[PDB]
Amino acid sequence: ETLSEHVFRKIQSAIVSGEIAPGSKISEPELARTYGISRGPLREAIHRLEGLRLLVRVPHVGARVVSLSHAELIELYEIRESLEGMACRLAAERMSQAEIDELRRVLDTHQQEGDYDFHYRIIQGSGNATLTRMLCGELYQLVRMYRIQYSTTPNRPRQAFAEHHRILDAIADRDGELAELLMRRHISASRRNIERQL
């Protein structure tokens, strides 16, 4: 990898983890001193970081960490509902029986840690590389910094496991229509859970 890519993921991880507070003023000088890179590759990283809605550009000031507002949550979970739901539909037709059985194995294994492995197996089982990039590469970063800033309720881990199993049941039955619907409801339950603390 190049240095421009190194400082990218180091800053991106500091934003998703809350290390840099949502809404902070990003100081390009003190950041170039923390990692020791010139302003060329640094501005290259901020531009990408603004593209993924992690940083936001202010005209007369500079870059700022995203507001982490309610409108941005609607924007994010909307796309995630349409994409993950379709991932369940495609995974139900395209997953081999070996991938399905391994999916139940992963689910049988079980702030909050979460079950990203469950969703990741389905997105991969959908057989769409572009879908995997848009979900796990772009959307899931802004998703995580919401779940990190706002912890779930103590009954949410139990509720999501039930939702996960019924989704798996529809996928294992080759019922993409039901799996897509069950996936959508589970995404909407996740958004309402986060909307409980704003």
Residues at the site binding a second copy, with contacts judged by CB under 8 A: 1-5, 40-41, 43-44, 47-48, 51, 53, 75-76, 78-79, 82-83, 86, 90, 128-131, 133-134, 137-139
Binding residue for ligand MIC, selected from 48, 64, 147, 165, defined by CB under 6 A: 147
Can you give 98-140 as a three-state secondary structure string? HHHHHHHHHHHCCCCCCCHHHHHHHHHHCCCHHHHHHHHHHHH
Whole-number Å distance between alpha carbons of 29 and 196: 37
State which residue, 76 or 178, has the beta carbon closest to ligand MIC. Answer: 76
Is 186 annotated as contributing to ligand binding?
Answer: yes
Is 119 annotated as contributing to ligand binding?
Answer: yes
42 binds ligand MIC (CB under 6 A): no
Residue whose C-alpha is closest to residue 136's, from 155, 151, 117:
117
Binding residue for ligand MIC, selected from 5, 33, 116, 196, defined by CB under 6 A: 116
Whole-number Å distance between alpha carbons of 26 and 31: 8
138 binds, among a second copy, Zn ion, ligand MIC, none (CB under 5 to 8 A by kind): a second copy
The 12-41 contact track toward ligand MIC, x by CB under 6 A, reads ------------------------------
114 binds ligand MIC (CB under 6 A): yes
Contact 170, 92 (CB under 8 A): yes
Contact 160, 116 (CB under 8 A): no
Whole-number Å distance between alpha carbons of 160 and 63: 36
Give contact residues for ligand MIC (rule: CB under 6 A).
Answer: 114-116, 118-119, 147, 152, 156, 160, 190, 193
